[PDB]
Amino acid sequence: PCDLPLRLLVPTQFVGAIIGKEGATIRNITKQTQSKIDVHRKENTGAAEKSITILSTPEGTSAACKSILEIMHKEAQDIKFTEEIPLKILAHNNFVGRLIGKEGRNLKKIEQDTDTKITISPLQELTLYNPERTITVKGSVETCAKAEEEIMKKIRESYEND
Template sequence: MPSEVDDREVSPSPGRSRSGSPAGPDTLTLRALVSTKDAGVIIGKGGKNVADLRDQTGVKAGVSKVVPGVHDRVLTISGSVDRVAKAYGLIVAQLVASNPTSPISASSSTHTSLRLLISHNLMGTIIGRGGTRIKAIQDNSGARMVASKDMLPQSTERVVEVHGSVEAIERAVDDIGKSLLEDWERGLGTVLFHPGAGDERSGSSRRYSENRGSYGGSRQSNGRPGSPGSPSRQAPSSPQPTNLRTQNISIPSDMVGCIIGRGGSKITEIRRLSGSKISIAKAPHDETGERMFTIVGTPEANEKALFLLYNQLESEKERRVGREQQQDIE
């Protein structure tokens, strides 16, 4: 059985890149969904294949750990655009060659696919106005791309499927990476997808991040609110479904006001639109000065609540950046 390779060494952290966005003007972190079987091929016996990939391309690469009952894992590759593209090309070729049941010979002309994870906020960058950018990428690479309409559970990432030959997919990844580099700041704050995040067997975590710091980590559990660090103020009670989930996210204290709104208007609207109960700790929960938000609801409701909270934070961040730029002009 192949050795697991933890993806923590390439996992984004504050000041580094998020999914589908680089840490700076020259570095890209690009994630993809792979089946558990394909992950085994990518890793290789004792981690040999992924180690060889790093040596050949100079990228950082890792595969997320297995989640029981979940059939997908996340492959994360970080490096310059050309190296990331080359690494994905080598991986796709390796997966094609490892499939002995395929009726088509494992040649460069064999058509296959790759499922990239792209931040919802960066989809417009890839698609372009009127679809011009995605058409150009497809024409240049010879690959075909299909973007999912919905974000993945408990995240703000979407899947972009890239179909074609090994060479076409590699060229498409290169073009996609260059597009993402042009607009990388839009990917800041992406809520990363973790396979099994909406499953009761999963205890996955994710982190909102931007260059100046972090929107904090989130912890998901199946218990009821009231664990250590839980907020003291609860949303009004209502009939509860049986599949409730509890998720905690920590938010910098200086951003809490923009989420609550004047007289609690914004947080009330988020509660109403999502259907989740959202309560806020009265005081910071640790030395970071961050405040804990507890979200309780169905997986679907919590996903919407996270999305709404995230959008509110992004809007506030853009407002502050605009205000600073205006002050600089004056």
């Protein structure tokens, strides 16, 4: 019963749609996926993005992630946001060696198995008090969701072993 959450970085402008008027959208998500979801109310001063923490079973976590991806994609269409919205996962640096693997073998396997392109933020962009690397996943809603499942499997495995 691993208790490491999934942490996402989403554009600030899509949070209103994720939560929904009176909280109705996120309330439905957390009910349906049996998840605890915490949306940061203050932007990271890094960029125009807010972090979302999702605590659930691996399956409930993946379902909540996909729901958020679906909501974001629909809002972008609705406001004619033309740019791509990659999935961004934050992961503590202590887990990223295993996600990448020797010679990048593990990350390349996830890219092939899910048809995505995954890039991880550079090690020297960390700060002493922000140890979280940004995992950027470019793909469709469907492939990004599959990538999240595989990515978090390796993160949890690192979490329980490294």
